[PDB]
Design an enzyme around this catalytic site. Structure first.
Site, PDB file in Angstrom:
ATOM      1  N   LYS A 111       0.680  -1.298   0.000  1.00 15.88           N
ATOM      2  CA  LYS A 111       0.000   0.000   0.000  1.00 15.88           C
ATOM      3  C   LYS A 111       0.699   1.335   0.000  1.00 15.88           C
ATOM      4  O   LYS A 111       0.273   2.205  -0.753  1.00 15.88           O
ATOM      5  CB  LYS A 111      -1.190   0.037   0.959  1.00 15.88           C
ATOM      6  N   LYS A 168       3.180  -7.071  -5.070  1.00 18.32           N
ATOM      7  CA  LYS A 168       3.599  -6.257  -6.203  1.00 18.32           C
ATOM      8  C   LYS A 168       4.324  -5.010  -5.738  1.00 18.32           C
ATOM      9  O   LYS A 168       3.822  -4.291  -4.874  1.00 18.32           O
ATOM     10  CB  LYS A 168       2.375  -5.862  -7.040  1.00 18.32           C
ATOM     11  N   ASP A 190       5.242  -1.199  -6.340  1.00 19.96           N
ATOM     12  CA  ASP A 190       4.785  -0.037  -7.087  1.00 19.96           C
ATOM     13  C   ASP A 190       5.710   0.208  -8.261  1.00 19.96           C
ATOM     14  O   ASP A 190       6.911  -0.053  -8.182  1.00 19.96           O
ATOM     15  CB  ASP A 190       4.754   1.168  -6.178  1.00 19.96           C
ATOM     16  N   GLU A 191       5.141   0.689  -9.362  1.00 21.38           N
ATOM     17  CA  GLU A 191       5.917   0.841 -10.581  1.00 21.38           C
ATOM     18  C   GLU A 191       6.963   1.947 -10.468  1.00 21.38           C
ATOM     19  O   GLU A 191       7.931   1.944 -11.231  1.00 21.38           O
ATOM     20  CB  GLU A 191       4.970   1.090 -11.756  1.00 21.38           C
ATOM     21  N   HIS A 194       3.959  -4.166 -16.290  1.00 24.91           N
ATOM     22  CA  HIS A 194       3.119  -3.044 -15.945  1.00 24.91           C
ATOM     23  C   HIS A 194       3.057  -2.053 -17.100  1.00 24.91           C
ATOM     24  O   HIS A 194       3.951  -2.005 -17.940  1.00 24.91           O
ATOM     25  CB  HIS A 194       3.677  -2.383 -14.695  1.00 24.91           C
ATOM     26  N   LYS A 196     -17.815   0.432 -14.804  1.00 24.99           N
ATOM     27  CA  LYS A 196     -17.801   0.910 -16.178  1.00 24.99           C
ATOM     28  C   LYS A 196     -19.057   0.457 -16.904  1.00 24.99           C
ATOM     29  O   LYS A 196     -19.687  -0.534 -16.530  1.00 24.99           O
ATOM     30  CB  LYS A 196     -16.568   0.410 -16.939  1.00 24.99           C
TER      31      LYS A 196
END
Lengths: 427, 138, 427, 427, 125, 138
Positions: free
Chosen positions: C141, C167, C169-170, C260, C300
């Site tokens: 997070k 994961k 963060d990019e 990513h 969406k």
């Protein structure tokens, strides 16, 4: 995604190590500008904070959000990390309708972490021994389809007549009709032959853009070992990691690095949305490149002329003041990082040469892809006709003449004593 | 339709595709050198040290990229510091070619605040050299 | 720049080796559609030729230009050459106002020249020994500011409770607060510990995106030698040359490659202008990657839902029919190139899980960056609550229940016997 | 920290393998000289033992402690280990107020463990083919701010007029205005051009002092591959480990190694405390270097003249007797280790040349950083004026004339037939 | 070796990229503090300039010379170049009797060019 | 203010920036060679083997540092062992240039106890060579 209290700090004073960003920001109808501006900043010691929001005059629903970033968010020496932090997630955000990053401020504590351009304007000019005038260029006219032998024959006759550089098409890499290594020899046979004849230093931008980093370094080893001066790289399609790798190799072995800008108008054309070229040109300088296609200025209004003069100063100068009329939204100290020579695609004919000498001065390459090839006598008289017109317009500048007005009378004074230019004056 | 000639057509980079500069045109360029704070200086080379060559690369490994010979020429005297008069430079062109009648001469300029060479252009060719074509080179 | 005779050939029959392109094309007012369409093709054996132009229904000034390209224009194995030829120059062209490349057709004679994804969906699933359900993920997070020790502690508790992947963060690459190599050890200490406890295979996408190709291979050597399963790469900011280099290294040493998509919405968001994601997702598959962020579908309308189901089939399937309703403009034979697993960013809570199992099925990773972290009990009960909800919805599918209707009654049947999900049912 | 019984052994007979040290030693008021002297030795088979203590005449509170060290305390081939054992801890000791190591004795069993200087005086002189006179040098006058092109132009005109060497400033390494690799080419273009013109061998000390051992070897590979004769190294700021690494590389590839002595006066200036230069010059010889800045002798009294003649004999000779008048406190057998050529900074003008030929003889380099640059005609007449004055004073020595008296009449006999020297005679 | 006009600039405002140095500086008897302080700076865009000179309380013949250096004098990532520029030649200078460099200021534009300590206190712990 | 000339100004390392040595000045140097135990010896080279060149480095890898050609000249006879008279050396200078009128001549000296070459200086230039300037070289 901000709560507008923590990420919109208008009372904040920016730091001298901060990365500053200026976003042209179109909200959805009903979203406030401050809440939309703090959301671009949100994406406490690591938060980016929107510190100023200005309306855009004439646009009823556009704003300029200024966002500051702490220098700890970034990797030393990495344009990949700098773009991934600033424009990596914000453009898909739903509360804004369109977003354009207009300018960045790179602070001098982060300019110094990069290697930068391998040589720059001042060192390249020393190494090629060409002074006091713009450099001249030509793309070989048929982009694809030649043999490798007939490619260098087109390269030989162009450098022979007076040009300083010839150029691979950016999609000339290695294809079944002309593999890359067969091309690098007939180019180097054509450079060393046009050099020995004219007595001047000659080059051809050999396209080292490749499929993998290992192919790309294999082309570049080949140019090292032929001893040819300059290679080129497509950096928005090869990427910034491949570019920065090549640019460090070019520094470590004395090759020059021309940089072409394929795919730039996917990113920079539209005004409401994208990344403007002046950000992509600052980022090329930080990554490295010795030349960069800056575009045409001829055939354009003088609102795009002042913008084009703005990002050329970001490429060449050391210290660029804030100037909203030229699109420069911050002050850029480049902290003795070397300049990048802009490459300007000249017009179809030689009559745009008084325009380009006055706009660009000396520190520019000028390219005539269909100016040398479209001469009725061939490539070597066509290359002379530009070189005669370039040096005639340069001399009229130093003698004091206004090339905005008297530039036609200077070309016509050189159509007289030179038959090659007169055959291009006739068209 | 003509053919640009490959035989005895050596050139010097700036103002060589123009006809040879008169003394009024050389004085017009030095006025441009003095109008800003640049420092004019003359150079010279013989016929064998004038244009570019590869001959020191016999001593090299693969470090030959953007190395050439004959990019340095010998300086004539010293740079004209505090030069305001363009005729003082033009006297030195006659004085150099009297000492060296078989030598090319170029006028270079240096920037004071940037400390780099700015402009460099050939102002004299020898008569005894057959390396150049007299402006009718087709 | 076409004369409309040579580059607009509507009587032409396309080849099975042709690269086909479909451009959404907005002309300037007064430019004909055929002359504007042949100019996109012009940019005889090497010419690209516009062979079909269709109006767009509902848009009074948009058209679909179909352009064919001969296979000789391209380098074998190069996404850099493929993008430089097709979108390298056309978007700056002045006679059109906006241009979007919508789809490509990659012919099977040119699909076979690429290495492709290192493993694919079928081999990755065999190696991780996870079958019959979607994979689960979580971004740690706080993107920046942790120590490296406290990063793996967040990585340990998430993989412990039931997730399959965590994961980076990019924009977590290597920063002053957490260098990359200190991160790779505390991640590998947290993976091997959460693995030994649960008995299941665990991974964390260690970000090998770096500043140069040599830094990037140095991170990847590090993941090889710790023996950790998977690394990640930002490929639109690292570029296609760095990606294809890493993807070949990942094949040659059995690492998996998460991909990513930072900077995608600079390129793909606007409808009138850019490169749509389905082209960028075909190109990722040809370059290589084992996973790819495909986006959210929850929240969406069902006009973006059918488009999202279209480019997920281009990623996963072998043969994709032409379907204009899903945005698929050509027929794509993938010629046994392996599939790419789409990564779908799940919603804030667990109630979007019946939506995602019905939309995606099993071959998808699902990520809950704020679903595991935002649980009132922590990371390990929050990771169980997703894993319980995922396997409950999967079981209701196999039993035959409609998750579009009965999906709330399946979550509520699992709030009963599981306290961890019930604490997330309560929020 | 000694108990004065075990570490003060005046009845001890020193060994021929012992390392001997001579400390100028100022006690605190009230500490005995023998207890303070044994504490320097203390810092049974491995103890250093103070074996002799002498008063210093004229100084009421200074002493000379002679300490012997067993040869087993030391690493073969390591100046880092030799300094760490002898001066690594003793100077912070509280019972003495100040401490100066004056001389060392290196025994021939430990001289032989070192590689030493790569060539020496006799081999360098053979390779440069310069005999029977001192070598001449010049620092390029502006230390920083030149371009790389304008640096070699200053290097070209100096070597052209008659000098044998030109010199990088010691803080010229690699800076934003002149990177190191752009400098090495314009230097090598200026050396090979001034060589072909004069017919004599020319060199420039290219500064290979660098930030890491890998940068430093990368500069040196560059000088190997250009084939230029000599590089330089700052060894008290680069350190002895970097110096000994470079000195072994210089032996293994036939490069010469000039050694500059930046930071020497932090260590050697003060008389009561530090390490005197004759220790640092013995240690340079053991580490290796072909040239070494020994300092000026002109403008000094003849009590520093006899000391300067003492450490020049330690550099050049094979066997140096004990001589307290020249500051030589031990006998030094150098056991056929090659000599180091001293580099002597000559005065502002040419009238110090009869002083330097008589003091130094032939085996010395002489540098005129402002002697060649400050000539009213330029660099090439200024370089001739030194070269004429050097060879005139050398000839008057061989003819038998006293240069201490007739040295003005020899310069004035050469102001007559040479106009270049006369323009420097006039200043 | 200064002429005291160009290298002693007390009206100068230091930069945020400047390397600052503070020298404890003992002159020879008869040498002025300003001329001795500008000589430490002398060793126009590349000159080091003494911008402040303070007496030392209790010492009748010691001074604190503050010298600023432009960041272009230095190699990125090199402590060897940083020491060779600042203390490489000044201590052998004859018009001062003793010299101590007391502190430096490393500006954050030059701190960032170094790799630094491999782990640090927080990562080692 | 003059210009040192670059054209035909080759030099030999010791005593070449001086005017050519007379027979009394050559005898004064041999007295210095005999006053200590040094051994005089003559050498000679033609115009193409006199000064330095790179031409054997076409056969090399990257081993070219401090390799040159034409640092050896051919010895004339043998070193004058037990030479006490400086006129015996001076007769050999006339005898060498009679045999080789197109050859430079240098007098080298060797040390006996150190076994190395000590001093080496040009004592004769040919008249047929245009490689050197007659001491008025500006």
């Amino acid at each position: 995604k901000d709560y507008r209290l923590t990420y919109y700090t208008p009372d904040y004073v920016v730091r001298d190590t901060d990365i500053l960003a200026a976003f042209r920001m179109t909200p959805q109808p009903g979203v406030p500008p401050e809440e939309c501006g703090a959301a671009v900043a949100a994406e406490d010691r690591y938060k980016g904070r929107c510190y100023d929001i200005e309306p855009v005059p004439g646009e009823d629903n556009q704003y300029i959000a200024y966002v500051a970033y702490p220098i700890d968010l970034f990797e030393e020496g990495s344009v990949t990390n700098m773009f991934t932090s600033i424009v990596g997630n914000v453009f898909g955000f739903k509360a804004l309708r369109a977003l354009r990053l207009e300018d960045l401020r790179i602070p001098p504590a982060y300019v110094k972490t990069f290697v930068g351009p391998p040589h720059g304007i001042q060192v390249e000019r020393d190494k090629l021994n060409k002074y006091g005038r713009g450099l001249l260029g030509c793309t070989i006219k048929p982009k694809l389809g030649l043999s490798a032998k007939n490619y260098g024959r087109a390269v030989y006759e162009c450098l022979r007549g007076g040009l300083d550089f010839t150029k691979d098409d950016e999609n000339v890499n290695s294809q079944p009709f002309m593999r890359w290594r067969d091309r690098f020899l007939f180019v180097a046979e054509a450079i060393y032959k046009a050099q020995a004849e004219t007595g001047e230093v000659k080059g051809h931008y050999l396209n080292a853009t490749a499929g993998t980093c290992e192919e790309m370094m294999k082309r570049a080893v080949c140019a090292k070992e032929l001893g040819v001066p300059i290679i080129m790289h497509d950096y928005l399609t090869g990427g910034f990691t491949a570019n920065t790798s090549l640019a460090i190799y070019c520094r470590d072995n004395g090759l020059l690095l021309h940089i072409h800008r394929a795919m730039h108008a996917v990113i920079d054309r539209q005004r409401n949305h994208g990344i403007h070229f002046r950000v992509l040109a600052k980022a090329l300088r930080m990554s490295g490149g010795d030349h960069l296609h800056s575009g045409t200025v001829v055939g354009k209004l003088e609102g795009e002329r002042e913008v084009t003069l703005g990002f050329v100063d970001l490429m060449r100068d050391d210290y660029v003041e804030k100037d909203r009329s030229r699109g420069i939204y911050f002050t850029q100290d480049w902290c003795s990082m070397p300049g990048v020579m802009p490459v300007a695609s000249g017009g179809i004919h030689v009559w745009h040469m008084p325009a380009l000498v006055e706009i660009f001065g000396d520190d520019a390459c000028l390219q005539f892809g269909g100016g040398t090839l479209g001469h009725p006598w061939g490539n070597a008289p066509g290359a002379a006709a530009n070189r005669v017109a370039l040096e005639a317009c340069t001399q009229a500048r130093n003698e004091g003449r206004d090339l905005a007005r008297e530039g036609g009378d200077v070309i016509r004074s050189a159509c007289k004593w030179s038959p090659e230019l007169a055959a291009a004056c006739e068209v | 339709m003509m053919v640009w000639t490959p035989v005895n057509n050596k050139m010097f980079e700036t103002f060589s595709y123009l006809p040879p500069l008169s003394d009024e045109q050389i004085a017009a360029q030095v006025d441009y050198i003095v109008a800003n704070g640049w420092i004019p200086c003359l150079e010279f080379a013989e016929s064998d040290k004038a244009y570019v060559s590869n001959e020191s690369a016999i001593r090299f490994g693969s470090v030959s990229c953007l190395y050439y010979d004959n990019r340095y020429w010998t300086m004539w005297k010293l740079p004209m510091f505090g030069c305001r008069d363009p005729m003082q430079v033009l006297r030195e062109i006659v004085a150099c070619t009297k000492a060296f009648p078989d030598a090319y001469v170029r006028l270079v300029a240096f920037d004071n605040q940037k400390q780099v060479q700015i402009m460099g252009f050939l102002v004299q060719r020898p008569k005894s050299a057959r390396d150049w074509q007299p402006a009718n080179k087709r």
